[PDB]
Amino acid sequence: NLWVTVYYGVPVWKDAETTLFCASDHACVPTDPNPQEIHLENVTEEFNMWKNNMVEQMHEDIISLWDQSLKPCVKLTPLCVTLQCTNVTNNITDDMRGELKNCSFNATTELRNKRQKVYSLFYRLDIVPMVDLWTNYRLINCNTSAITQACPKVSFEPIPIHYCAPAGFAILKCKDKKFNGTGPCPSVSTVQCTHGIKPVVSTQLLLNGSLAEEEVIIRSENITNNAKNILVQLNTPVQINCTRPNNNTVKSIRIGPGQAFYYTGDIIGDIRQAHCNVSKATWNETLGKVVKQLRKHFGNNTIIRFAQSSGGDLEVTTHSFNCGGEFFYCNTSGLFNSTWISNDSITLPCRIKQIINMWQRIGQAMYAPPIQGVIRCVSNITGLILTRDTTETFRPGGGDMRDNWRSELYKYKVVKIEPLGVAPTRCKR
Amino acid sequence: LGFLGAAGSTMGAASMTLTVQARNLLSHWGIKQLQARVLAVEHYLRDQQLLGIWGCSGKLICCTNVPWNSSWSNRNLSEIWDNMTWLQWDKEISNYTQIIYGLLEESQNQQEKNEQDLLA
Amino acid sequence: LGFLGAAGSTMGAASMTLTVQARNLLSHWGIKQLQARVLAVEHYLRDQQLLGIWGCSGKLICCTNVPWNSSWSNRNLSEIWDNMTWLQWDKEISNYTQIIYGLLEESQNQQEKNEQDLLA
Amino acid sequence: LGFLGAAGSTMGAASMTLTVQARNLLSHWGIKQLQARVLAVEHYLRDQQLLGIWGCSGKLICCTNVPWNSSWSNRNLSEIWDNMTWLQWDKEISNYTQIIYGLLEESQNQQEKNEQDLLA
Amino acid sequence: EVQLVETGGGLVQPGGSLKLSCRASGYTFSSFAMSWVRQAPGKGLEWVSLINDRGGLTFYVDSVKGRFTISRDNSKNTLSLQMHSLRDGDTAVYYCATGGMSSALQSSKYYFDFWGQGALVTVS
Numbered sequence: 044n045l046w047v048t049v050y051y052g053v054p055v056w057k058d059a060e061t062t063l064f065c066a067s068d069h070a071c072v073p074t075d076p077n078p079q080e081i082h083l084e085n086v087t088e089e090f091n092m093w094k095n096n097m098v099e100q101m102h103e104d105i106i107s108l109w110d111q112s113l114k115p116c117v118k119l120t121p122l123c124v125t126l127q128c129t130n131v132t133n134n135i136t137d138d139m140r141g142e143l144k145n146c147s148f149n150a151t152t153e154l155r156n157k158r159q160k161v162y163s164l165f166y167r168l169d170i171v172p173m174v175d176l177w178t179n180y181r182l183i184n185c186n187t188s189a190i191t192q193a194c195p196k197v198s199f200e201p202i203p204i205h206y207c208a209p210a211g212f213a214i215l216k217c218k219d220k221k222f223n224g225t226g227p228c229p230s231v232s233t234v235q236c237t238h239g240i241k242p243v244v245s246t247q248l249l250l251n252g253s254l255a256e257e258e259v260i261i262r263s264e265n266i267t268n269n270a271k272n273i274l275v276q277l278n279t280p281v282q283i284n285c286t287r288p289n290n291n292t293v294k295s296i297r298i299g300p301g302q303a304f305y306y307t308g309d310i311i312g313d314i315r316q317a318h319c320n321v322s323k324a325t326w327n328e329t330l331g332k333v334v335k336q337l338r339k340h341f342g343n344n345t346i347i348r349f350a351q352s353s354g355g356d357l358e359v360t361t362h363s364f365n366c367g368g369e370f371f372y373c374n375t376s377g378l379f380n381s382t383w384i385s386n387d388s389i390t391l392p393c394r395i396k397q398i399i400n401m402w403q404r405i406g407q408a409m410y411a412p413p414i415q416g417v418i419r420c421v422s423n424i425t426g427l428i429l430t431r432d433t434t435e436t437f438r439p440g441g442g443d444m445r446d447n448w449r450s451e452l453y454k455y456k457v458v459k460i461e462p463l464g465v466a467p468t469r470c471k472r
Numbered sequence: 473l474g475f476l477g478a479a480g481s482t483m484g485a486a487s488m489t490l491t492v493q494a495r496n497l498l499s500h501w502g503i504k505q506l507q508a509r510v511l512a513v514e515h516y517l518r519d520q521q522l523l524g525i526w527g528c529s530g531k532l533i534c535c536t537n538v539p540w541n542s543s544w545s546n547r548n549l550s551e552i553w554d555n556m557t558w559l560q561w562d563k564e565i566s567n568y569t570q571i572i573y574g575l576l577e578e579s580q581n582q583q584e585k586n587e588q589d590l591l592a
Numbered sequence: 593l594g595f596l597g598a599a600g601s602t603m604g605a606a607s608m609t610l611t612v613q614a615r616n617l618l619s620h621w622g623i624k625q626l627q628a629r630v631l632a633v634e635h636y637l638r639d640q641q642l643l644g645i646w647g648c649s650g651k652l653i654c655c656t657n658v659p660w661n662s663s664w665s666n667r668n669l670s671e672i673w674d675n676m677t678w679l680q681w682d683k684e685i686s687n688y689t690q691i692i693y694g695l696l697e698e699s700q701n702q703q704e705k706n707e708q709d710l711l712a
Numbered sequence: 713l714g715f716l717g718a719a720g721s722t723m724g725a726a727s728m729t730l731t732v733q734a735r736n737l738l739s740h741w742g743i744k745q746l747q748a749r750v751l752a753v754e755h756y757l758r759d760q761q762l763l764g765i766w767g768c769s770g771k772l773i774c775c776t777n778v779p780w781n782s783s784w785s786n787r788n789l790s791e792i793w794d795n796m797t798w799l800q801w802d803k804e805i806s807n808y809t810q811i812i813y814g815l816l817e818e819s820q821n822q823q824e825k826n827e828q829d830l831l832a
Numbered sequence: 833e834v835q836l837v838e839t840g841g842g843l844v845q846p847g848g849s850l851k852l853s854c855r856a857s858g859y860t861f862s863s864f865a866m867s868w869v870r871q872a873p874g875k876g877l878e879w880v881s882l883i884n885d886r887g888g889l890t891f892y893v894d895s896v897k898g899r900f901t902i903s904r905d906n907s908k909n910t911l912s913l914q915m916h917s918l919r920d921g922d923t924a925v926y927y928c929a930t931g932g933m934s935s936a937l938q939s940s941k942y943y944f945d946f947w948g949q950g951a952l953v954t955v956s
């Protein structure tokens with residue numbers, strides 16, 4: 044009765060892992076002016092963030108670009124010498140005691156038979172109290188890898204990157220406003236390329252990301268498993284104002300044939316600690332919303348407590364971020380010190396470092412040239428990364444950057460188009 | 473009316489947008505992009521080679537001489553082509569697909585040899 | 593008589609050298625060599641896919657069922673085909689091209705469905 | 713029954729495995745691998761283009777209108793097909809190949825123009 | 833309830849032309865093939881012409897093959913037949929009927945499901 048009929052151009056697909064390419068406005072494809080989203084009126088599909096390979100590709104490309112940008116920059120190997128460090132001749136407040144040191148050293152110069160005396164200011168965190176010879180201290184990473192100076196012409200602005208499908212593939216987007224990262228999504232659309240995602244690198248407080256459309260959303264791979272992180276997306280931003288209120292004079296020297304080293308010469312005015320401001324009421328409302336949602340996963344007649352990280356190094360116990368090119372490490376214990384049972388602002392002290400590792404790696408370091416003048420930046424807190432220990436206790440986490448990327452890519456899936464298929468009809472040759 | 477727009481529609485409707493999907497099959501830093509272009513081409517060519525083997529070259533809708541052994545799917549036309557979407561159909565008869573492809577290949581080989589002996 | 597030798601001749605003459613041009617469409621330091629080879633293939637395949645969509649697969653000359661609306665060009669058959677080269681023709685009807693391609697696509701879809709019903 | 717299994721068999725037997733071989737034509741460090749993948753595609757496409765030129769597109773066994781000038785091989789159809797393997801045949805008539813291919817192309821060009829003139 | 837209503841012509845002279853039309857309602861018009869069946873006043877039924885549901889495919893009996901045109905308009909739910917050269921032998925009731933063919937993703941037909949009442953066409 045019925046015969047096999049072959050159809051080509053059949054609108055079906057399978058889950059797939061393929062190579063994605065980027066587009067933007069060091070460079071790849073020009074940003075596509077029109078993503079051409081297609082609604083797919085009756086398509087329901089299953090999404091599963093945390094098993095999403097788009098995350099791994101974003102991870103690898105961001106790190107690779109970071110490394111490529113340092114290839115032509117000065118390698119500060121002539122500076123791994125003993126230092127002679129003493130205290131700073133200025134008005135230093137208690138919060139800065141001691142925090143800074145005035146270090147002199149013998150630098151190489153343009154000619155090999157010449158040497159020069161240079162002194163500069165260092166943060167205590169960038170030096171180690173060793174040597175114990177004629178001199179006191181050496182630079183932190185001259186016992187692991189050599190430091191590379193970032194080129195002064197290169198900014199670290201998080202310019203957004205779009206991720207585009209290759210021919211034969213498509214990206215499906217979940218538009219369900221209540222989607223928690225996994226399972227069926229009743230409203231799915233097809234796009235050619237994702238929206239631009241800003242490669243913002245930070246730890247416990249996610250900055251400048253997307254907000255939830257209606258309500259705070261708590262997403263976790265396994266909510267009852269303390270080994271998993273909890274990504275909390277806010278439906279409202281919390282504004283945070285960060286500053287480094289010290290007017291730096293930046294000087295430079297040649298350490299070799301075309302190799303210029305940058306350093307802080309001195310500080311104009313009083314010396315004060317860098318800090319960030321979070322409005323107090325706003326923060327209290329934000330937590331109240333988070334608590335209401337946590338109570339839907341945990342017992343309702345419960346107690347939710349917030350606490351500061353219990354340990355690890357500066358990279359994970361603080362809020363790490365880039366503010367105007369400087370690297371801040373802010374103490375958030377002022378944000379996560381409360382218990383919730385059934386024009387004020389919060390100031391977060393911030394530490395500054397010039398020699399950073401960025402990624403969780405051993406063999407690389409970077410020196411961030413100090414910046415002339417005074418730095419101020421304003422960012423939006425768009426989500427939190429929390430971990431969990433009656434009374435449930437939550438603490439800031441976020442050491443693995445993949446989680447920052449998951450908070451933006453959770454709504455996208457890659458599928459392979461399989462246009463060939465068969466079905467019975469009455470038609471025969 | 474765009475790419476995969478008909479994916480949630482019934483097979484009897486979706487069969488009219490075959491050109492929409494067919495047109496979306498073709499088009500160190502920069503190497504992975506070149507690799508992606510090469511593999512997209514290879515997948516395209518394999519589908520075209522297979523259609524050629526079955527005698528479906530050059531067409532989007534190809535009728536054959538192989539019958540539908542009910543053991544693969546015992547649903548009637550006015551279920552398959554009025555209710556199910558191609559995605560639900562593909563899942564239903566995913567298992568018994570290599571069997572169908574094998575039958576289509578044999579059918580075409582018999583047809584090519586029969587024709588050679590009718591042009592004699 | 594070689595590649596593009598007929599470019600300066602009239603359309604009615606040039607049409608006899610279609611195989612000459614068709615045969616010349618195929619075949620970090622050095623990476624650009626691969627990029628060039630890959631794009632030559634991609635362009636070739638797009639032309640072949642399009643001929644497939646229109647039902648012209650496998651032919652260099654393909655007649656269709658779409659009629660020539662005079663608005664595209666009202667020149668009579670012996671002002672086009674023995675008084676005008678292909679280069680001048682392409683310029684004459686450049687704007688009205690995507691229209692024709694769209695019509696050819698629709699024509700073939702109508703043709704494929706009708707045939708299927710006749711083979712029941 | 714596998715790839716090239718029929719290579720030592722007579723032409724009259726080997727001709728039944730054409731799909732076996734056809735399916736084995738498709739599928740700084742890493743560049744030589746891309747080069748190998750690209751050339752596999754280019755060789756495939758040239759064979760397909762040539763079959764298209766000759767009017768053999770979409771089929772594995774193509775009869776034509778070109779006759780066998782005995783000066784190519786004056787052997788008879790119980791020797792060529794029952795006593796010779798494709799490898800031996802290919803060697804026998806390797807000299808006179810770019811004559812046959814030229815004739816096949818010419819024959820098809822005439823067939824296309826005659827067919828357009830009939831459809832008028 | 834399915835209805836087919838012929839709104840045809842009347843008495844015409846031989847060698848001229850007459851156009852019939854049929855309006856349909858109660859079902860999706862576009863889902864069905866349609867045909868005309870003829871009945872001479874003293875005879876049985878004769879199939880005359882068939883048209884596909886999308887209007888692309890038409891078939892006729894040899895006796896009217898070079899004379900009749902069958903058409904369709906799916907926006908107006910209308911079936912029509914234009915007859916030329918009107919033989920006296922074409923006097924008959926012309927019935928509008930639904931069925932006679934399917935579209936090869938549908939269950940088969942090859943019978944008629946619905947009938948109109950018929951237009952009477954008389955050729956002098």
Ligand SMILES: *[C@@H]1O[C@H](CO)[C@@H](O[C@@H]2O[C@H](CO)[C@@H](O[C@@H]3O[C@H](CO)[C@@H](O)[C@H](O[C@H]4O[C@H](CO)[C@@H](O)[C@H](O)[C@@H]4O)[C@@H]3O)[C@H](O)[C@H]2NC(C)=O)[C@H](O)[C@H]1NC(C)=O
Pocket residue numbers: 196197198199200201243245250251364365366367368420421422423
């Ligand atoms: C979250 O989003 C906000 C809003 O976009 C973002 O704040 C922006 O940060 C950039 C970088 O610090 C600011 O850009 C600078 O603006 C000053 C204005 O005086 C300019 O002078 C700067 O130019 C000098 O430095 C460049 C190198 O960085 C040189 O290339 C240049 O030649 C100059 O010497 C530079 O343009 C921008 O103004 C703010 N925007 C606002 C509204 O304040 C914040 O950084 C994001 N947060 C995170 C964590 O990413």
Ligand SMILES: *[C@@H]1O[C@H](CO[C@@H]2O[C@@H](C)[C@@H](O)[C@@H](O)[C@@H]2O)[C@@H](O[C@@H]2O[C@H](CO)[C@@H](O)[C@H](O)[C@H]2NC(C)=O)[C@H](O)[C@H]1NC(C)=O
Pocket residue numbers: 541542543544568571
């Ligand atoms: C139609 O199929 C039956 C059984 O189908 C088998 O199982 C189905 C689920 C699916 O996988 C089919 O492709 C399988 O063939 C056939 O009956 C059997 O056929 C095989 C050979 O194909 C034979 O070895 C068995 O002994 C047969 N008996 C059984 C177990 O039913 C039947 O021959 C097929 N008919 C047609 C028209 O192809």
Ligand SMILES: *[C@@H]1O[C@H](CO[C@@H]2O[C@@H](C)[C@@H](O)[C@@H](O)[C@@H]2O)[C@@H](O[C@@H]2O[C@H](CO)[C@@H](O)[C@H](O)[C@H]2NC(C)=O)[C@H](O)[C@H]1NC(C)=O
Pocket residue numbers: 661662663664688691
């Ligand atoms: C043939 O062309 C005329 C003119 O159409 C214009 O030029 C064509 C190349 C194309 O660009 C059309 O979109 C242009 O309008 C057509 O006449 C007009 O067609 C449009 C679209 O159908 C319609 O809105 C106008 O009312 C028409 N005007 C007239 C004077 O009739 C004509 O329809 C074309 N015929 C065919 C076979 O498509």
Ligand SMILES: *[C@@H]1O[C@H](CO[C@@H]2O[C@@H](C)[C@@H](O)[C@@H](O)[C@@H]2O)[C@@H](O[C@@H]2O[C@H](CO)[C@@H](O)[C@H](O)[C@H]2NC(C)=O)[C@H](O)[C@H]1NC(C)=O
Pocket residue numbers: 781782783784808811
């Ligand atoms: C069949 O071939 C004969 C012999 O042709 C020679 O061998 C062929 C394989 C090829 O290499 C030819 O070019 C050789 O000439 C043909 O007889 C000759 O044909 C050519 C034209 O092709 C002509 O110039 C010669 O004068 C002819 N005479 C000889 C014996 O050399 C014969 O015409 C061919 N028949 C067909 C069907 O084309």
Ligand SMILES: *[C@@H]1O[C@H](CO)[C@@H](O[C@@H]2O[C@H](CO)[C@@H](O)[C@H](O)[C@H]2NC(C)=O)[C@H](O)[C@H]1NC(C)=O
Pocket residue numbers: 130131132133145147162309310
């Ligand atoms: C760091 O130490 C240097 C000396 O090595 C200080 O520089 C001198 O400052 C005095 C004034 O107090 C001047 O008279 C000298 O000419 C300066 N010497 C040089 C080489 O510049 C410097 O002021 C100290 N800086 C801080 C912040 O303590």
Ligand SMILES: *[C@@H]1O[C@H](CO)[C@@H](O[C@@H]2O[C@H](CO)[C@@H](O)[C@H](O)[C@H]2NC(C)=O)[C@H](O)[C@H]1NC(C)=O
Pocket residue numbers: 171183186187
């Ligand atoms: C580079 O120097 C640092 C600082 O001295 C080393 O870290 C210390 O290691 C000792 C054990 O040998 C611990 O007792 C200290 O508490 C560590 N200090 C800090 C601040 O963590 C580091 O191991 C050295 N790296 C290499 C490769 O030798």
Ligand SMILES: *[C@@H]1O[C@H](CO)[C@@H](O[C@@H]2O[C@H](CO)[C@@H](O)[C@H](O)[C@H]2NC(C)=O)[C@H](O)[C@H]1NC(C)=O
Pocket residue numbers: 284285286318319320388390
């Ligand atoms: C962050 O908040 C502090 C308050 O805790 C602000 O400090 C005040 O700034 C004004 C204006 O310069 C001074 O008059 C007050 O005396 C300061 N108060 C204290 C306690 O120091 C600070 O300006 C805010 N700023 C940011 C992020 O730049």
Ligand SMILES: *[C@@H]1O[C@H](CO)[C@@H](O[C@@H]2O[C@H](CO)[C@@H](O)[C@H](O)[C@H]2NC(C)=O)[C@H](O)[C@H]1NC(C)=O
Pocket residue numbers: 351360361373374375376
């Ligand atoms: C943020 O500041 C608080 C002080 O308010 C630090 O908390 C103290 O940590 C020491 C151990 O180093 C404990 O002995 C004290 O009892 C803690 N004080 C309080 C009030 O709890 C905290 O360690 C700092 N966190 C970071 C990341 O710098």
Ligand SMILES: *[C@@H]1O[C@H](CO[C@@H]2O[C@@H](C)[C@@H](O)[C@@H](O)[C@@H]2O)[C@@H](O)[C@H](O)[C@H]1NC(C)=O
Pocket residue numbers: 546547548549550551939
């Ligand atoms: C099509 O089938 C529908 C369900 O009935 C039955 O189950 C399917 C799987 C077939 O095996 C069929 O033969 C059985 O009747 C019926 O509701 C529907 O009426 C059937 N329609 C037609 C056109 O037969």
Ligand SMILES: *[C@@H]1O[C@H](CO[C@@H]2O[C@@H](C)[C@@H](O)[C@@H](O)[C@@H]2O)[C@@H](O)[C@H](O)[C@H]1NC(C)=O
Pocket residue numbers: 666667668669670671
């Ligand atoms: C073809 O027409 C010639 C004049 O061309 C006129 O103008 C061109 C631009 C077109 O619009 C064309 O249709 C017009 O008629 C005549 O000189 C010539 O003899 C005609 N040839 C034939 C075959 O009729």
Ligand SMILES: *[C@@H]1O[C@H](CO[C@@H]2O[C@@H](C)[C@@H](O)[C@@H](O)[C@@H]2O)[C@@H](O)[C@H](O)[C@H]1NC(C)=O
Pocket residue numbers: 788789790791
């Ligand atoms: C095919 O040829 C067979 C052998 O024929 C002889 O040997 C070959 C090598 C040539 O030299 C030929 O001229 C000789 O006559 C015949 O036994 C057989 O019948 C032939 N078959 C046909 C169809 O011709």
Ligand SMILES: *[C@@H]1O[C@H](CO)[C@@H](O)[C@H](O)[C@H]1NC(C)=O
Pocket residue numbers: 132133134312
């Ligand atoms: C340090 O503070 C004293 C007041 O205690 C002031 O007289 C002196 O000028 C200040 N020095 C600097 C470098 O600001």
Ligand SMILES: *[C@@H]1O[C@H](CO)[C@@H](O)[C@H](O)[C@H]1NC(C)=O
Pocket residue numbers: 130140141142
């Ligand atoms: C230098 O600063 C440290 C830390 O604040 C302090 O303990 C030490 O006594 C100071 N020494 C001098 C000479 O000022």
Ligand SMILES: *[C@@H]1O[C@H](CO)[C@@H](O)[C@H](O)[C@H]1NC(C)=O
Pocket residue numbers: 223224225226227261262263264265266
């Ligand atoms: C997310 O929602 C799905 C709905 O089916 C549920 O099964 C899953 O447990 C939820 N996961 C979390 C972390 O809330």
Ligand SMILES: *[C@@H]1O[C@H](CO)[C@@H](O)[C@H](O)[C@H]1NC(C)=O
Pocket residue numbers: 264265267268
């Ligand atoms: C979550 O972790 C617990 C650990 O005891 C395990 O029993 C449970 O099955 C896990 N749930 C999921 C969804 O992985």
Ligand SMILES: *[C@@H]1O[C@H](CO)[C@@H](O)[C@H](O)[C@H]1NC(C)=O
Pocket residue numbers: 282283284320321322388421
């Ligand atoms: C940040 O600075 C703006 C002025 O640029 C001010 O209006 C806003 O209140 C400040 N935000 C916080 C949290 O202090």
